[PDB]
PDB file of C-alpha atoms in Angstrom:
ATOM      1  CA  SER A   1     -22.153 -55.660-154.843  1.00 18.54           C
ATOM      2  CA  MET A   2     -21.789 -52.854-157.263  1.00 18.58           C
ATOM      3  CA  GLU A   3     -22.706 -55.279-160.105  1.00 20.69           C
ATOM      4  CA  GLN A   4     -26.061 -56.261-158.400  1.00 20.90           C
ATOM      5  CA  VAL A   5     -26.853 -52.552-158.117  1.00 21.95           C
ATOM      6  CA  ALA A   6     -26.046 -51.932-161.821  1.00 17.44           C
ATOM      7  CA  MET A   7     -28.227 -54.954-162.737  1.00 16.50           C
ATOM      8  CA  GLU A   8     -31.013 -53.506-160.576  1.00 11.93           C
ATOM      9  CA  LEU A   9     -30.705 -50.060-162.252  1.00 11.94           C
ATOM     10  CA  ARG A  10     -31.103 -51.817-165.725  1.00 10.34           C
ATOM     11  CA  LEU A  11     -34.232 -53.664-164.496  1.00  7.46           C
ATOM     12  CA  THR A  12     -35.618 -50.405-163.164  1.00  3.73           C
ATOM     13  CA  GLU A  13     -35.019 -48.710-166.444  1.00  3.69           C
ATOM     14  CA  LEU A  14     -36.632 -51.662-168.367  1.00  2.00           C
ATOM     15  CA  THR A  15     -39.579 -51.334-165.988  1.00  2.00           C
ATOM     16  CA  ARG A  16     -39.742 -47.631-166.875  1.00  4.16           C
ATOM     17  CA  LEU A  17     -39.787 -48.385-170.584  1.00  4.57           C
ATOM     18  CA  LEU A  18     -42.337 -51.291-170.200  1.00  7.03           C
ATOM     19  CA  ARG A  19     -44.607 -48.995-168.202  1.00  8.82           C
ATOM     20  CA  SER A  20     -44.696 -46.539-171.106  1.00  7.27           C
ATOM     21  CA  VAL A  21     -45.255 -49.510-173.567  1.00  4.19           C
ATOM     22  CA  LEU A  22     -48.103 -50.774-171.365  1.00  3.23           C
ATOM     23  CA  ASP A  23     -49.740 -47.372-171.324  1.00  2.33           C
ATOM     24  CA  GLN A  24     -49.535 -47.072-175.066  1.00  2.00           C
ATOM     25  CA  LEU A  25     -51.019 -50.598-175.599  1.00  2.00           C
ATOM     26  CA  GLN A  26     -53.801 -49.985-173.144  1.00  2.00           C
ATOM     27  CA  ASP A  27     -54.773 -46.788-175.037  1.00  2.00           C
ATOM     28  CA  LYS A  28     -55.516 -49.054-177.976  1.00  2.00           C
ATOM     29  CA  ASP A  29     -58.306 -50.566-175.818  1.00  2.00           C
ATOM     30  CA  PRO A  30     -60.559 -47.605-175.310  1.00  2.04           C
ATOM     31  CA  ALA A  31     -63.571 -49.784-174.515  1.00  2.87           C
ATOM     32  CA  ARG A  32     -61.598 -51.266-171.539  1.00  2.00           C
ATOM     33  CA  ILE A  33     -62.462 -54.782-172.655  1.00  2.00           C
ATOM     34  CA  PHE A  34     -59.035 -56.043-171.517  1.00  2.00           C
ATOM     35  CA  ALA A  35     -58.607 -53.852-168.432  1.00  2.67           C
ATOM     36  CA  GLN A  36     -59.482 -56.385-165.759  1.00  2.44           C
ATOM     37  CA  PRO A  37     -59.620 -60.202-165.320  1.00  2.00           C
ATOM     38  CA  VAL A  38     -62.530 -62.002-166.800  1.00  2.00           C
ATOM     39  CA  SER A  39     -64.893 -62.360-163.784  1.00  2.00           C
ATOM     40  CA  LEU A  40     -65.282 -66.014-162.618  1.00  2.00           C
ATOM     41  CA  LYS A  41     -68.522 -64.946-160.911  1.00  5.41           C
ATOM     42  CA  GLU A  42     -69.920 -63.813-164.299  1.00  5.23           C
ATOM     43  CA  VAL A  43     -68.150 -66.454-166.482  1.00  4.34           C
ATOM     44  CA  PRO A  44     -68.043 -69.443-164.124  1.00  3.76           C
ATOM     45  CA  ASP A  45     -66.732 -71.936-166.741  1.00  6.57           C
ATOM     46  CA  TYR A  46     -63.892 -69.629-167.941  1.00  2.00           C
ATOM     47  CA  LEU A  47     -61.014 -71.724-166.588  1.00  2.00           C
ATOM     48  CA  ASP A  48     -62.374 -74.814-168.317  1.00  2.00           C
ATOM     49  CA  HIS A  49     -61.651 -72.918-171.584  1.00  2.22           C
ATOM     50  CA  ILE A  50     -58.690 -70.665-170.846  1.00  2.00           C
ATOM     51  CA  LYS A  51     -55.818 -72.073-168.833  1.00  2.00           C
ATOM     52  CA  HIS A  52     -53.733 -68.949-168.410  1.00  2.00           C
ATOM     53  CA  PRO A  53     -56.002 -65.875-168.050  1.00  2.00           C
ATOM     54  CA  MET A  54     -54.452 -62.453-168.504  1.00  2.00           C
ATOM     55  CA  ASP A  55     -55.472 -58.790-168.516  1.00  2.00           C
ATOM     56  CA  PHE A  56     -53.911 -55.358-168.270  1.00  2.00           C
ATOM     57  CA  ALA A  57     -54.383 -54.943-164.481  1.00  2.00           C
ATOM     58  CA  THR A  58     -52.632 -58.271-163.873  1.00  2.77           C
ATOM     59  CA  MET A  59     -49.730 -57.157-166.129  1.00  4.65           C
ATOM     60  CA  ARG A  60     -49.485 -53.886-164.301  1.00  7.03           C
ATOM     61  CA  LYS A  61     -49.151 -55.702-160.916  1.00  5.48           C
ATOM     62  CA  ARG A  62     -46.327 -57.814-162.325  1.00  4.94           C
ATOM     63  CA  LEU A  63     -44.680 -54.804-163.912  1.00  4.05           C
ATOM     64  CA  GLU A  64     -44.662 -52.761-160.684  1.00  2.35           C
ATOM     65  CA  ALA A  65     -43.138 -55.641-158.792  1.00  2.00           C
ATOM     66  CA  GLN A  66     -40.371 -55.523-161.485  1.00  2.00           C
ATOM     67  CA  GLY A  67     -41.492 -58.984-162.529  1.00  2.00           C
ATOM     68  CA  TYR A  68     -40.700 -58.699-166.259  1.00  2.00           C
ATOM     69  CA  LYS A  69     -36.976 -59.604-166.820  1.00  2.00           C
ATOM     70  CA  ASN A  70     -36.994 -58.835-170.543  1.00  2.00           C
ATOM     71  CA  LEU A  71     -39.426 -57.631-173.263  1.00  3.19           C
ATOM     72  CA  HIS A  72     -40.129 -61.255-174.370  1.00  3.44           C
ATOM     73  CA  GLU A  73     -41.820 -62.025-171.010  1.00  4.73           C
ATOM     74  CA  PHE A  74     -43.968 -58.855-171.316  1.00  6.46           C
ATOM     75  CA  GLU A  75     -44.945 -59.716-174.862  1.00  8.10           C
ATOM     76  CA  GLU A  76     -45.900 -63.217-173.798  1.00 10.27           C
ATOM     77  CA  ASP A  77     -48.458 -61.744-171.380  1.00  9.00           C
ATOM     78  CA  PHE A  78     -49.795 -59.261-173.960  1.00  7.90           C
ATOM     79  CA  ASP A  79     -50.225 -62.073-176.479  1.00 10.65           C
ATOM     80  CA  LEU A  80     -52.193 -64.096-173.852  1.00 12.26           C
ATOM     81  CA  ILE A  81     -54.685 -61.275-173.556  1.00  9.65           C
ATOM     82  CA  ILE A  82     -55.308 -61.358-177.329  1.00  7.70           C
ATOM     83  CA  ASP A  83     -55.090 -65.099-177.899  1.00  5.33           C
ATOM     84  CA  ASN A  84     -57.365 -66.036-174.919  1.00  2.00           C
ATOM     85  CA  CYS A  85     -60.056 -63.628-176.254  1.00  2.00           C
ATOM     86  CA  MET A  86     -59.839 -64.919-179.814  1.00  2.00           C
ATOM     87  CA  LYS A  87     -60.383 -68.481-178.566  1.00  2.00           C
ATOM     88  CA  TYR A  88     -63.209 -67.868-176.032  1.00  2.00           C
ATOM     89  CA  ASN A  89     -65.172 -65.459-178.185  1.00  2.00           C
ATOM     90  CA  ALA A  90     -66.470 -66.048-181.664  1.00  2.00           C
ATOM     91  CA  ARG A  91     -65.369 -64.063-184.717  1.00  2.00           C
ATOM     92  CA  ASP A  92     -68.616 -62.097-184.908  1.00  2.00           C
ATOM     93  CA  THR A  93     -68.347 -60.580-181.424  1.00  2.00           C
ATOM     94  CA  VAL A  94     -67.281 -57.155-180.181  1.00  2.00           C
ATOM     95  CA  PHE A  95     -64.766 -58.952-177.944  1.00  2.00           C
ATOM     96  CA  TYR A  96     -62.985 -60.835-180.730  1.00  2.00           C
ATOM     97  CA  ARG A  97     -62.982 -57.758-182.903  1.00  2.00           C
ATOM     98  CA  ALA A  98     -61.511 -55.666-180.078  1.00  2.00           C
ATOM     99  CA  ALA A  99     -58.664 -58.166-179.757  1.00  2.00           C
ATOM    100  CA  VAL A 100     -57.877 -58.084-183.444  1.00  4.55           C
ATOM    101  CA  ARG A 101     -57.698 -54.250-183.367  1.00  3.19           C
ATOM    102  CA  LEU A 102     -55.494 -54.367-180.209  1.00  2.00           C
ATOM    103  CA  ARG A 103     -53.118 -56.863-181.863  1.00  2.00           C
ATOM    104  CA  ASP A 104     -52.882 -54.818-185.050  1.00  2.00           C
ATOM    105  CA  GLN A 105     -52.388 -51.469-183.326  1.00  2.00           C
ATOM    106  CA  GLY A 106     -50.075 -52.858-180.663  1.00  2.00           C
ATOM    107  CA  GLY A 107     -47.711 -54.330-183.278  1.00  2.00           C
ATOM    108  CA  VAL A 108     -46.395 -50.874-184.124  1.00  2.00           C
ATOM    109  CA  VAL A 109     -45.680 -49.997-180.462  1.00  2.29           C
ATOM    110  CA  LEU A 110     -44.010 -53.333-179.806  1.00  4.61           C
ATOM    111  CA  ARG A 111     -41.862 -53.107-182.965  1.00  5.76           C
ATOM    112  CA  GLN A 112     -40.248 -49.860-181.698  1.00  8.69           C
ATOM    113  CA  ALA A 113     -40.011 -51.144-178.134  1.00  9.80           C
ATOM    114  CA  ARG A 114     -37.848 -54.032-179.299  1.00 10.32           C
ATOM    115  CA  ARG A 115     -35.529 -51.617-181.119  1.00 10.19           C
ATOM    116  CA  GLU A 116     -35.332 -49.398-177.912  1.00 12.00           C
ATOM    117  CA  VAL A 117     -34.610 -52.332-175.639  1.00 12.54           C
ATOM    118  CA  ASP A 118     -31.793 -53.601-177.970  1.00 10.57           C
ATOM    119  CA  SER A 119     -30.512 -50.045-178.669  1.00 11.80           C
ATOM    120  CA  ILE A 120     -30.332 -48.857-174.977  1.00 13.71           C
ATOM    121  CA  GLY A 121     -29.220 -52.418-173.942  1.00 13.67           C
TER     122      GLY A 121
END
């Protein structure tokens, strides 16, 4: 149908906007701490601690499959990255501190994204 096509154009455009959001958030992680999945070879007990692992490469795979239906879903994944790190790592660690800085800096980007998503529909 023509409606399914229109719906698909909207998803494609959301995917375009979320790609730009993802790039901007990932720039706030210059140490690349959150770039890839925590390695189960190197942290063999990880899944005993963290039930839903997340990282920027994993988000990017979902994004490029047009797997985010709305900004809420995308934000859920970004928040997992931060919240998983803040649980597994102690306060006095470069990892925890990196997550705090990512959360704080990302807030700004995500605030305007929400306005853009609502504004453009």
